[PDB]
Design a protein around this motif. Sequence first.
Motif, short mmCIF file in Angstrom:
data_model
loop_
_atom_site.label_atom_id
_atom_site.label_comp_id
_atom_site.label_asym_id
_atom_site.label_seq_id
_atom_site.Cartn_x
_atom_site.Cartn_y
_atom_site.Cartn_z
N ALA A 9 92.04 105.37 52.22
CA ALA A 9 91.49 104.66 51.07
C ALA A 9 90.05 104.17 51.30
O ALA A 9 89.22 104.26 50.40
N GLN A 10 89.77 103.65 52.49
CA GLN A 10 88.42 103.22 52.84
C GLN A 10 87.44 104.38 52.74
O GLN A 10 86.39 104.27 52.12
N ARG A 11 87.82 105.50 53.36
CA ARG A 11 87.01 106.71 53.36
C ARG A 11 86.87 107.25 51.94
O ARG A 11 85.80 107.69 51.53
N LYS B 228 84.99 104.35 49.69
CA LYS B 228 83.77 103.76 50.28
C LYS B 228 83.89 102.25 50.45
O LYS B 228 82.95 101.51 50.15
N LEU B 229 85.04 101.79 50.91
CA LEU B 229 85.28 100.36 51.05
C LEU B 229 84.77 99.88 52.40
O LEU B 229 84.65 100.68 53.33
N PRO B 230 84.47 98.58 52.52
CA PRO B 230 83.96 98.05 53.79
C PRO B 230 84.92 98.29 54.95
O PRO B 230 86.13 98.09 54.80
N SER B 231 84.38 98.70 56.10
CA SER B 231 85.16 98.86 57.33
C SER B 231 85.78 97.54 57.80
O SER B 231 86.76 97.54 58.53
N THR B 232 85.20 96.43 57.35
CA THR B 232 85.70 95.10 57.67
C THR B 232 87.05 94.74 57.01
O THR B 232 87.65 93.72 57.36
N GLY B 233 87.53 95.55 56.07
CA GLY B 233 88.90 95.41 55.56
C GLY B 233 89.08 95.04 54.10
O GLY B 233 90.20 95.09 53.58
N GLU B 234 87.99 94.69 53.42
CA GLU B 234 88.07 94.20 52.04
C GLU B 234 88.61 95.27 51.10
O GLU B 234 88.08 96.38 51.06
N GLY B 235 89.65 94.93 50.36
CA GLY B 235 90.28 95.85 49.42
C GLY B 235 91.52 96.55 49.94
O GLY B 235 92.32 97.05 49.14
N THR B 236 91.70 96.61 51.26
CA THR B 236 92.86 97.28 51.84
C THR B 236 93.72 96.33 52.67
O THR B 236 94.49 96.77 53.54
N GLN B 237 93.64 95.04 52.39
CA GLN B 237 94.41 94.06 53.15
C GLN B 237 95.90 94.29 52.99
O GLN B 237 96.66 94.07 53.93
CL LIG Z 1 88.70 98.16 53.19
#
Ligand SMILES: [Cl-]
Length: 207
Positions: A141-143, A146-155
Amino acid sequence: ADLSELLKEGTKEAHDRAENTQFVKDFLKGNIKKELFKLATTALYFTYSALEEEMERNKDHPAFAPLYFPMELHRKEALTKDMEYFFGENWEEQVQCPKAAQKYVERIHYIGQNEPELLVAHAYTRYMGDLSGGQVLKKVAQRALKLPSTGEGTQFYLFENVDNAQQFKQLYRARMNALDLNMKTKERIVEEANKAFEYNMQIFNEL
Ligand SMILES: [Cl-]
């Protein structure tokens, strides 16, 4: 005789069926636009809130209490953070409960307030499936979005308070199998588990 064995053997068909619904097949690629992902996040919010409210309600119920792991398993707070990221602080004033989710939410509130021995079914199917994929789906999902590698949106996909999934799964198995259940109730849990999967796919089949 073991509940986990009855579940495992008697829901393989529905579990394999679930793991290539239209939405899921796309996800393992990865695909899916942000707008579908946000909707799934919205739907998952409401269903996990429902389930975790009922699980707290039956915190001290003999048929469920050994499976109560708020800090290790519950997702409402993770989904909350995710909704905050996509939709903003007043996300709760924006979105609405989608109608496939509300069917399931109504089911969960019935089970929770009338047949709490069957919560095991909904909890087993949701949290063990989530704990399984988490770390992999997170990266897809991050890839893909294009979500932040820091975790936002996939918690939602991150189980921060579980040192090892496969060891924790075995604990959950033993706690589940140590429930004082007659064989009849075990078969009803298996039936209710299959319904859990049914409910899940029809949610995911809706924009
Ligand atoms: Cl994320």
